[PDB]
């Protein structure tokens, strides 16, 4: 059923493993998620940027996430608002249902970060929602453990090398693991890992195939995402690769067939790509069979 | 707020107009329709196909509907099931909250036609649901009959689309006879401007003609009241998603590509509003 976000992670937390928090706009990428989670048994995180939000609706992307499980009730899910810029922001997302929010205000400096997460806190957590804020212009692991005390806050995402997109990495992959790890002991709550999408060889392959360019393109090697996880990973945020693989199966039907305007043939191989993109990330990550 | 089918076609029928009947089968499409409808202050008829209801879920079909009804309360909408082929399918949606069901038996004969569409409208009135079935081209004193005992809320009528040129006086008999709602089906409108986007988009339509305009002005004239419209918004759509996917080889943001394709469908929505005379009919 749809419950508080802390709920999930908590559990992850307590156990050592990840769980993927998966970016949607519409109802085919919303479809596939969840039949990833039904077919691997996996709990499921489901967020909606400020500009999905403004895309759907925000009474159509709680709604439609709230018709979900109910198709699903033995799958925990929290709706998860991803990357609040402002208070009002994350009070909206609260008053329509969202379960977790996430102010991000690490451009600021640490006090002005601090007191605008607590005051987040303090609405959301009045509502029974949970709260996620960010760290990291990478993280200071001290900064990191007065943050937490003093905030409240249910998790934290603290930067150690990611980046948004699909161009996160021009040398070699490297996130900070010994940051990671401090920052871990110090706070002892579920972390969050963004820019998380890995662009596996297959999804790169499938949309270079249908005439896509993805010219420089590095995600966070699978190992790294495993190493997130063993080093107190647990919530794991993923869009790109959804959107690659979706759109790849797009563009295969736009190519091969150019009389074909039914929108279901377009969609229902791009909704099985992304399903499949999120199982396998369920099963690396862990939260496969957490049901 | 959502309304029974007949609600909307009896106003359409006693003052001569005819309301489109617009499929969806996702989000987008469902958003352009009812933006086109708040646009030009017009009552909707939303459809799905078997295949769409099967594609979404009909729980995820109907509540997305609700979600936009309450998000523009003051339009009047009904939500439809298009060509349903049997009686189990019609009671589902039904249940599902449907508030008009269509049953196709117009390829069987006459007799089976009108048993099968009597059953649907026996369960259907008693759930407050309207009821639309098809007759074939058709034989205006069978479709007297065809109304008279079956007591279905609209008829179909095979008056001259290549369906499952317009015969005018034929259907002005069938009207007089059965004065009821009159649907028309097959009768998509493929636009100049949507041709031409579909093909500037690498599209191949190639023998896809659509009915003129004057086709569906016409058909309104002589008594059409609901004009069944999914073609037409399918190839807005795709090729605006042809076209992005052609002029930026990195785009993989889905709004990139589903934003202008909403517009396109919205527009042709708006036109096809005007055009069968349901603009400012709120
Ligand atoms: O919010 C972070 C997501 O990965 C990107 O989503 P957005 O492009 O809809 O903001
Ligand atoms: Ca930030
Ligand atoms: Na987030
Ligand atoms: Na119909
Ligand atoms: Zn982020
Ligand atoms: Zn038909």
Redesign the interface.
Same mark, same amino acid.
Not at 134 to 140: F, I, M, W, Y
């Given at each position: 059923m749809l419950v508080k976000g802390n709920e999930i992670l908590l559990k992850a937390h307590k156990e050592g493993y990840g769980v993927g928090a998966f970016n949607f706009?519409?109802?085919?990428?919303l479809?596939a998620i969840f039949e990833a989670g039904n077919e691997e048994n996996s709990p499921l995180f489901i967020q909606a940027s400020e500009?999905?939000i403004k895309? %759907? &609706?925000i009474? %159509?992307a709680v &709604?439609?996430v709230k =018709? %979900?499980c109910? #198709?699903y009730p033995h799958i925990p899910v929290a709706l998860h608002l991803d990357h609040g810029t402002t208070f009002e922001s994350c009070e909206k997302a609260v008053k329509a249902g969202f379960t977790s929010v996430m102010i991000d205000a690490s451009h600021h400096a640490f006090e002005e970060n601090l007191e605008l997460t607590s005051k987040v806190v303090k609405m959301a957590h009045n509502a029974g929602v949970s709260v996620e804020a960010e760290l990291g212009r990478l993280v200071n692991p001290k900064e990191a453990e007065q943050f937490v005390k003093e905030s409240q806050v249910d998790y934290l995402a603290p930067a150690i090398g990611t980046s948004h997109g699909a161009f996160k990495f021009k040398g070699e992959p490297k996130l900070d693991f010994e940051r990671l790890q401090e920052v871990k002991r110090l706070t002892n709550i579920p972390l969050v890992l963004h820019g998380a999408s890995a662009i596996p060889d297959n999804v790169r392959k499938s949309?270079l195939d249908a &005439? &896509? @360019?993805?010219?420089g393109s590095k995600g966070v090697p699978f190992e790294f995402l495993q190493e997130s996880v063993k080093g107190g990973i647990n919530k794991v945020n993923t869009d790109?690769d959804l #959107? =690659?693989a /979706? =759109?790849?199966e797009?563009?295969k039907v736009?190519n091969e067939d150019?009389?074909? /305007? @039914?929108?279901?043939k377009?969609?229902?191989p791009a909704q099985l790509a992304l399903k499949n993109v999120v199982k396998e990330r369920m099963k690396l990550l862990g939260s496969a069979n957490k049901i």
């Amino acid at each position: 059923m749809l419950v508080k976000g802390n709920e999930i992670l908590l559990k992850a937390h307590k156990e050592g493993y990840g769980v993927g928090a998966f970016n949607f706009v519409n109802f085919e990428m919303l479809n596939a998620i969840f039949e990833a989670g039904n077919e691997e048994n996996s709990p499921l995180f489901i967020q909606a940027s400020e500009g999905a939000i403004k895309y %759907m &609706g925000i009474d %159509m992307a709680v &709604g439609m996430v709230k =018709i %979900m499980c109910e #198709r699903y009730p033995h799958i925990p899910v929290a709706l998860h608002l991803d990357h609040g810029t402002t208070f009002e922001s994350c009070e909206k997302a609260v008053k329509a249902g969202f379960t977790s929010v996430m102010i991000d205000a690490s451009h600021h400096a640490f006090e002005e970060n601090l007191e605008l997460t607590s005051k987040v806190v303090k609405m959301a957590h009045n509502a029974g929602v949970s709260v996620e804020a960010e760290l990291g212009r990478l993280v200071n692991p001290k900064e990191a453990e007065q943050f937490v005390k003093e905030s409240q806050v249910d998790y934290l995402a603290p930067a150690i090398g990611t980046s948004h997109g699909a161009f996160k990495f021009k040398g070699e992959p490297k996130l900070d693991f010994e940051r990671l790890q401090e920052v871990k002991r110090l706070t002892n709550i579920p972390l969050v890992l963004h820019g998380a999408s890995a662009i596996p060889d297959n999804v790169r392959k499938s949309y270079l195939d249908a &005439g &896509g @360019d993805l010219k420089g393109s590095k995600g966070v090697p699978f190992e790294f995402l495993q190493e997130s996880v063993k080093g107190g990973i647990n919530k794991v945020n993923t869009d790109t690769d959804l #959107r =690659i693989a /979706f =759109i790849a199966e797009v563009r295969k039907v736009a190519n091969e067939d150019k009389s074909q /305007f @039914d929108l279901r043939k377009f969609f229902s191989p791009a909704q099985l790509a992304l399903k499949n993109v999120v199982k396998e990330r369920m099963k690396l990550l862990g939260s496969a069979n957490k049901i």
